[model samples]
Target chain A: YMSRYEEITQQLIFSPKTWLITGVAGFIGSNLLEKLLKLNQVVIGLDNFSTGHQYNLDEVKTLVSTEQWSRFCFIEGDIRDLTTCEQVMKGVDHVLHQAALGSVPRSIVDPITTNATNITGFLNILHAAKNAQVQSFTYAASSSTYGDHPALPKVEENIGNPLSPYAVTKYVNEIYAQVYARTYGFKTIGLRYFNVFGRRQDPNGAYAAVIPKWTAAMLKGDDVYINGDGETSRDFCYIDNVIQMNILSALAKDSAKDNIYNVAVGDRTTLNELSGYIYDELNLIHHIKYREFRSGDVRHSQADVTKAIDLLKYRPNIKIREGLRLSMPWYVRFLK
Target chain B: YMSRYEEITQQLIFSPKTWLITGVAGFIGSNLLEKLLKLNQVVIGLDNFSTGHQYNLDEVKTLVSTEQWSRFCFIEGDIRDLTTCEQVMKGVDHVLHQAALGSVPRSIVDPITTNATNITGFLNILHAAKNAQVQSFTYAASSSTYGDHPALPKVEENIGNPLSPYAVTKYVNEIYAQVYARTYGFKTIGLRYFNVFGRRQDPNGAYAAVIPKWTAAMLKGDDVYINGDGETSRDFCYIDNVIQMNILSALAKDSAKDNIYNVAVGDRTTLNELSGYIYDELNLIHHIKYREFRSGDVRHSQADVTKAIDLLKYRPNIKIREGLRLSMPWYVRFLK
Candidate 1:
């Protein structure tokens, strides 16, 4: 597996494939861009800098070599506009569509804006990619699509009703993808990510994820409050794992193409356990607190990643505890 | 049953509750406006005249008493704008959200427009209604939500993947409704209307429904083209039945709210049978022709109205053959 990835990397270095990554100044987008640039691929990125920061892009530039960085092209544009999509998708071989408004509560508070960006923006990108006749189109679908299902380990095929407007928007993306495949013969792949956490995740928002928020609080000696009984669980896959899945799904051959795979480690960690693990890692630094349950959050979320393993050849290299340790240093440095 | 409807109607008439009806100049909207005005209800109507006509509003004005008609306030606006939504929803007691871009083929051709109006517009109305704290918010859901499900009679709970973009948009409306109920304590009733056909449904549009299109063709001595093998089926519901369902769902006690009910006559009619019935009805007028299958149409659709009956006291007053006969005179006048 290592040799295969190395071989692919070597091949990609000599003959660079033009890649288009939307939302390229945000958490997952910036991380993916860093990896692709390091592989010596010609990368074209689009960011409206709404929630995404210019600092994230600046940080990415420092991580890659100057020669590798030279292959990158950045465009300041919104995906909600079709012309912006068309302009950016020109001559792009593969599209990694990651631009979307995140958070269920944020959507519930302001669903129209969320719908405009997530639903309309997604359609704009898909239409542009289809019109441009790009080689492969991969999008960041959410595990929130599992919504209200009582199942412990969520699967790709069966899904329950969406519990929030954000979930509805994400589910709509999948519906459009399936229809586009049948209607327009655009066989795209969707990566259903479950609680991806790592560096560059916005830590100072009303809708920030638990990991980054808690890490920031700990580093700053601020009171870290765990929502609910501290028993709410998640798959909490690392950013590297997510990036790996996207790359694998995007480059997969015919049999592995045109389908969604759960990009997770098939592991479950309750918030209490997660808090304890974080505390153990950073006990020398600060203490944590507890609070009531937050609205629009799932009680338990675990994924069955057998499809990803079988199809995308994905094997999550880092477990939750190890990933948390790796991410803690960045939070400390950023907060300091 | 008749007494119950009369009692409810009497209460509404004496009290004269405030109503906000979106799409108030379209076929169903005009019918609804006419009925509500006659009941002495104060109505605020919003229409963009996209598919709705000024003539429909004029017809409503002529149908109701002048004093009652004077009580109706019309806002010529689109639901796609949140400000328009806020303006229309203000001081409204109950909302009847009937606005949507109708037809599957239209959505297939220009899905972005359909999504913008249907999905995004729906969210705007719903959010505004939630914020306004309306008494009962009810919107037009569709039988297309049944999508690719194999069941003969579609129920409220079970559904399949949406077959077309139009189907997806309608289903997303229900998803948003359910989410609103769960997340914000906002209860909304969704009446999934089957093929509702009646007078004032435009026959000029590229995406006109079969009844009006066929009726118009027959009346004009033009060739009537039957899509598919004419064996494709639907639960042909009349407009009055739809109107009844809307009133029942809207006025239903809190126990019967926050869920979707199929507002259809529990009768299946194949296109062949429907065409034959139409030919018989218009035999004195012209001939009919058969054509290839229309894309994005469901193969078979029949609704189980048990949920509606149990919850909303809904009953089909007009059967298909009778409904067809009743609609004939409208086509004759419309064609002229």
Candidate 2:
């Protein structure tokens, strides 16, 4: 009630819009689908399920009412194909482009595939949206773009070199988006997501996010191995906060367009601290092990989210402790 | 005799090495091919003739001796295909990756193809080269990467936001090159070419570069239109200097690897000055018109080539005046 997110939600409920979410079967995409459906908005979702799962889509259906569910039209397609992107983008008023290969390690192992999905696929969606003249376009950029900038709190303007291929792809997305704005008068907002986690965030993949992966290990009595000295930190953002940033970005004013925003709570938490929070939340003993520091990873990452707050009226109310408490039960239920 | 480029040439001739030049049918590729064949190096050339020409390769064969030409093998292949990249990379010692769709207007008109060739195709080649454990990888980066930054002499480390899709692609090449160096320990050098112009620079295309296109227009009694107020400037490097940088880069010391250098003469020339130079060189000036400045173009550009000079021992001995003199006769001969 204290933020514009409340006002935006009320407005969205009163008057609905058609939204297109690429990678709609994945964690953030599925979460976005659930929220849009609940708000009585029409949603067109596209996912190839290369890393996404059918169950994520299935789980989304049970969370919404029958009539709300009817508004969603799911299309199983890849963004790598321009024809498919153009087809999905036909009637969409807002574009939430999230289709990309996610892991720095996976990209290290295979950069070609990562580049195809992130760079090539992102261009396909962006080009289609520009031609369609969508009302607003918001794509998921990453905080990994802060690559080696030794700043305590990462700012959008101050960025260092990209440490991994995945980081390079995300950084390129912002560059292309800005160029499109200048060259073709197409507007876009790039959200540099910190480390979004919540319900349905899959913990089974070799490239899963640390929060979900560590939680899953704790729930199953498996050892949680830290990639570094356990002090490698991140501004672990909750999924709902990310959802707020995306919607706010889509409905932002013309002045706010053609820019990038840091989408994260301005709070830093180390891997060791995170493990204790997860263990304490679940009331379980977690085996926390340390190992050789992973290559292509920055030592610390904390976002200076004031730009998001000022520009998009972003309010990151959910801190890491509460986010863990909120997310712990989902893992507990899923594991059982 | 004055630079390492000469020393490197002697070494290559004394002991021939297997070299791979992508886009061998293109202007720069063919020039490199011609020089390497003359030095009696075993060369593997790859080109799809998308924007390249068979005539360029034909011209190269005529320049080298029969036995030297016998050591050359040409493959009609595209770098967009990973299989083709891997296949052509067999037993290659040094990789001169120059296969990219060049031109800001072409990329603006169709960014997909540009991304496909520049970003996707680049990864395919870089990944293949990394796996093959090539001794050296040198790629054609661009001065366009100095997008919107207003600086007298552009430095390698300081770059502004990418102004166009073409600029983004070129900058991404450097980013990926650096990431590969960090993540995979694959050493490489990126030459940020500042408007390289000389013989065989295709004059017949909707997206032809300024020098060749203007040379043809002057020769054919056509109007030469400048896209700006004639104040927009460039470094206007020559093709021979580019060739020197490539060979020197390939044989640079380990400390010089994983670096990007400005391959320019540290001199700036506006469109007005450049047009005057061309007219004076050819003793021909018919019609010159000025139009609205093109979007996605920088106002001024001159490289701080100290990095290349200090590290790679690069000697940009050919100034624009001498380069235009050397280049004018080739256009005259080819047009006739």
Candidate 3:
């Protein structure tokens, strides 16, 4: 017997639809844009380039054919503005709202700025989408939302008090999304991405993702700082898996339309093990170093992706090692 | 046998501490200021006169003794500015943060302004308090945080999705407070007030509370509009009880700190019955005209105040009916 997700994927590929991906110049946004454009679907891309880089968009341009790239309309604006939301949302069918300030330490130092961009900006987009009567509103929720919860594998229903300003802001996004669904009949699907890392993920910022940071440090033969004895574990998901989940969630007409689902590989990897993997992959290039554990970092985190599989028909294809190997070339090439 | 709360209350009255009360010109804030001043406590009262009125502050001034009044210092400044927060927070023992933009309709119409006052302003006070190392930070939370959950008698731990932008903002306050405690060891208490009503509640705004609005309408023999069906119920907590909860929560030991407790009478009253009570109270004066229901109003709401009672030793002195009786006379005097 064939699986339900296989049938749905086949159906979606044959008859593609228009998608509006916010934060199109950012890592995940550009990756999603590349995939959707390759699928020959019309994609409306939006980014303000505050944290997102122009190089990521350039990379997407190089990856896709001119005909495929022609189907993309890039709107340069901030999601904090309501008119931008209204303007970009016209003739848009699906919204993948991934725009936000994405680091815990940054939020800790400057919470008001994070609140303005993440909380206020998220609301502006959500309100505009609800008014526009979009088909499906999918947003990039975070694993940091499982703040102080000590569960081995975090579930969608059970979440603890948020630990940092960034965690609080992301959790608030889920809360607002659920409320919008209840109050305005605007159904939203939240993908709680678990330490997502892959190609185009910025490794140059003060708040860089661990994988990219580690990869860059190893390639450049620099010291790598590990928070908490390098034993801190996370379910590090890859970019392709996230893209798959987003596509499935945007297209799926299931009862799980108005709820949150964990988009993870369901495999926990300790920072020591993760460092070993990255060093092993980049050993063909150079060596790695370690330092003290960071504060406001969770001790251990893993996700129960059962909800995503059941609801969105999501099946994560990339394992951590394979993902690391695939993403190594991009870092090496970009750094050079 | 005497309870711990009674002991604390007794001790607090005998040896009062310096207090900082934000929104000192608003309904619940003014009441808290009045009660604290009567206890012979020094208070730093701050109000921007945005939604708050000078008349309320004047009313509070008259209710206290000349010496008690002398102990009060007023600052006309907005919490949105950080310098004002720092200036007022110096030497403050405890902070009663009751300043915020209320009403679901108001938030839905203009969310940006609400975001500025509630979210940004709240962060400013919290940051200032943390820097000043205040003894305790107590803030006004809301029952609307329990959005869309089908549960009756809402508990502190279990919260449903928020139904409005206002609810989202209030819930965000709780989230940020929890984050502050975890990240910076800042101890903060949140009083999740359920439809707080009594004297000094403004009745001349587009977003007035139902009790004050109805009372004012009945006093003037005008039409009183009820939102949603008559079945819409709320745990209409009186101002005095809320004042008691604030004082109790602020003085409670560290174990009872950094948590949200529902400040309510634990009695749910429907709009129909509530309007009937107001009508009966006003029968000696005039008749009431009932109108259609309003949107963005919760269908039913009641709080389980066990946390407040158990943790803060909070014992409500007046029920809704008794509180209404006391407030009706104020409406009769103020409206005439």
lDDT of each: 0.86, 0.91, 0.85
Candidate 1: deviation at residue A1, Å? Answer: 5.4
lDDT of 3 by residue, A1-336 (tens): 224545655665688777899999998999999988888778888889999988888898899999989989999999878889889988888899999989889988888778878887888888888888888899999998988888979999888878789888899889888777766778899999898888999989888989998888887778878876678899989898898888778877848788899989999999989988998888765544556666678889899998887777678778798898888888988997
Question: Candidate 3 clashing pairs?
Answer: A227-A293, A227-A294, A228-A293, B227-B294, B228-B293, B228-B294
In DockQ, how does model 2 score against the reference complex? 0.88
DockQ score of each predicted structure, in the order shown: 0.70, 0.88, 0.58
Interface RMSD of 2: 0.7
Model 2's C-alpha root-mean-square deviation from the true structure amounts to 1.9
- lDDT tens digits by residue: candidate 2, A86-155: 9998889999998988989999988999999999999999999999999999999999998988898999
- Per-residue C-alpha lDDT of model 1 across residues A261-320, encoded as one tens digit per residue: 898888999998987777777764443677888788889999999888777778787789
Best by TM-score: 2
TM-score of chain A of each: 0.96, 0.98, 0.96
Ranking by TM-score: 2, 1, 3
DockQ of 3: 0.58
TM for every model, in the order presented, reads 0.96, 0.97, 0.89
* CAPRI verdict (incorrect, acceptable, medium, high) for model 1: medium
Considering only chain B, report the TM-score of each candidate against the true chain B: 0.97, 0.98, 0.96
Question: Model 2: clashing residue pairs?
Answer: none
